[PDB]
Chains A and B, each alone.
With several copies, the nearest count.
Chain A
Amino acid sequence: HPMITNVAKQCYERGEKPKVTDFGDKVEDPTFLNQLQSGVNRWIREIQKVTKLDRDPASGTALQEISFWLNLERALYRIQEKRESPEVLLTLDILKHGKRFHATVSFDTDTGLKQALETVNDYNPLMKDFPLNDLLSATELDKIRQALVAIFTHLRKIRNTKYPIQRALRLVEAISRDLSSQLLKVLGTRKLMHVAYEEFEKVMVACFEVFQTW
């Protein structure tokens, strides 16, 4: 709010933290409190625009899902930092002073920021060390098998992470799509026409070893 910004500027120029009493009689003005509460409602709307975000797991590759969840955590922590700022806390304190408890309780709960943060932190172990960078960078069948084994060793850590079973299954489908693309790209470069049959048997033995590992 411009008035809160002006008072914060005035109290910072004096080298002092802001306070509710710095506004004085303006805290009792119904119009000022109504403007602050409308601003807080707008803040709740903007925060809900982010905390309600979700992405279809079937569409897009697994890297897209992991990037989405990591960016969701990155933005949720930024919003959490912005909520603790002196200006927002001063606005909430002023509204609480005028007994406009609706705005404060809604901002505490109606935003859903706490639930979203709890869920995204619960999702943190799975997205923290998701090893698909090795598979996407792998150019040999042995490296692809090693990356697949590492991927499933990391998916072993889904027991202590809350995740929908259907969503995890779609994520495994995405991993399969990436594996198919990587195998297609690797075997395309082998130039099977310009080489003999024993190496072909070796290549298919490696490929079906990868499939059995899957």
Chain B
Amino acid sequence: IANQPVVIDNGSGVIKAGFAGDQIPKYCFPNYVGRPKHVRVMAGALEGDIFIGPKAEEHRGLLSIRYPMEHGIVKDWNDMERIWQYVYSKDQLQTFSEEHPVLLTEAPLNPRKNRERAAEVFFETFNVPALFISMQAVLSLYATGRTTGVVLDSGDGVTHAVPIYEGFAMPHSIMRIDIAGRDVSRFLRLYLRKEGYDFHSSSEFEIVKAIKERACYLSINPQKDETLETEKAQYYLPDGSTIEIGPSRFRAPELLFRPDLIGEESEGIHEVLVFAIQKSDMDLRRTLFSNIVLSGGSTLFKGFGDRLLSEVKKLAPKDVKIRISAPQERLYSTWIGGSILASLDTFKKMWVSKKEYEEDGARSIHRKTF
């Protein structure tokens, strides 16, 4: 027995937290730690060397930004502990961690040590009554309400196509690549450098991320738009200066469909989806093609749906209906799924209890997650 479970979808880009049963995640904030890089000289300056959440965004020019997660894998565990502490602070969730079961999310095919260390942190440092490390794609499909389909979740750190049959994620058909929104923004930074506009600072990488979110689109025909004269839309920087983007506007999100633009010999996002579908059973391929669900932030590019549909039709067999679903709540689909799962009474039978972790350890999460 414990309080209402707390859902924490910890992405590489932004963490989304709330209590189970809420319609949307009420507590969303970027997943980075900001530390001041300048010299504090006077009394009355900003307090604390660690800035997380909207306090980091308000003073963004003052801070060096560090991302703990990279490609869905926690690289700095002290920063991850700080961020999860902030999730429980008086600014977010206003509650003690010793009272609420947690439903953490983890991207598929992650390292085992990542899940083990996450459970160790959540059971030792935060002393949670219970824990359940879920997978993002199956939760997104639960949020959509369907039971069978393919979830092509493309987040900040990792993109992956996961087919689910009657609620069970087929584990031998999961396709994953590490090219995601952060890679697209790094590519955009490189192209802006090739256009004369140079950004170095970790705080200016957030300006590059904003440029990606604001003025970038996917052209239906890359070669046709490539040869034509560009329009050079102008973007207003935070300081008031302007920059003319031009060809970098559409070649930056092209990285999702062509990783070879950065020398990676990995599949494209359309190839990820189609190979996940074609690696599954021959009986399920028709219903998997007829049920494709987009998710994550990187699926919000202008013209993403039409471009992916064209690519999948190019790769898919003929006489097979293709229906890519792009719900409005793509950013919070996986969190809404975690909230739906945690509301059920069956979730009581799913979590690893605190005593179970105390007596077993990593094996408890290893059997219970799978």
Contacts and interface: CB of A to CB of B under 8 A. Distances in A.
Direct A–B contact in complex, judged by CB atoms less than 8 Å apart? yes
Interface of A: 30-31, 33-34, 37-38, 41, 44-45, 98-103, 105-106, 108-110, 114, 118, 125, 157, 159-160
B127 A157 contact: yes
Interface string B23-57: 00010000000000000000110010000000000
B347 to A, nearest CB: 8
A30 B93 contact: yes
B78 interface: no
B99 to A, nearest CB: 7
Contacts of A37: 3-4
The 4 closest A-B pairs by CB, nearest first: A99-B21, A109-B43, A100-B4, A41-B1
Given A31-B94, A37-B3, A38-B99, A99 B343 contact: yes
Contacts of A31: 94-95
B47 A44 contact: no
Contacts of B3: 34, 37-38, 41
A114 B47 contact: yes
A101 to B, nearest CB: 6
B47 A159 contact: no
Given A99-B343, A101-B21, A34 B44 contact: no
B187 to A, nearest CB: 40
Interface string B126-165: 1100000000000000000000000000000000000000
Interface of B: 1-5, 19-22, 26, 43-44, 47, 93-96, 99-100, 124-127, 343, 345, 348
Contact of A30 (B19, B99, B343): B19
Contacts of A114: 47
Contacts of A110: 1
7 contacts: A30-B26, A31-B95, A34-B99, A98-B21, A99-B343, A105-B345, A108-B43
A100 B100 CA distance: 12
Contact of A101 (B2, B26, B343): B343
Contacts of A100: 4, 21
Contacts of B21: 98-101
Contacts of B44: 105, 108-109
B93 to A, nearest CB: 7
Interface centre among B3, B96, B100, B125, by most A CB within 10 Å?
Answer: B3
A103 B124 contact: no
Contacts of B20: 99, 102
B121 to A, nearest CB: 10
B1 A45 contact: yes
A159 B124 contact: yes
A106 B1 contact: yes
A168 to B, nearest CB: 17
Contact of B95 (A34, A106, A125, A159): A34
Nearest to A105: B345
A157 B97 CA distance: 12
B22 A99 contact: yes
B95 A105 contact: no
Nearest to A114: B47
A99 B19 CA distance: 10
B337 to A, nearest CB: 15
Nearest to B23: A99
Contacts of A106: 1
A103 B127 contact: no
Contacts of A98: 21
Contacts of B47: 114, 118
Contacts of A102: 4-5, 20, 343, 345, 348
Contacts of B127: 157, 160
A155 to B, nearest CB: 13
A109 B345 CA distance: 11
Contacts of B345: 101-102, 105
Contacts of A41: 1-3
Nearest to A45: B1
Given A41-B2, A102-B345, 18 more contacts: A30-B26, A34-B4, A34-B95, A34-B100, A37-B3, A38-B3, A38-B99, A44-B1, A98-B21, A99-B343, A105-B44, A108-B43, A108-B44, A109-B43, A159-B125, A160-B125, A160-B126, A160-B127
B43 A105 contact: yes
Contacts of B93: 30
A100 B4 CA distance: 6
A160 B345 CA distance: 31
Contacts of B1: 41, 44-45, 106, 110
A33 to B, nearest CB: 7
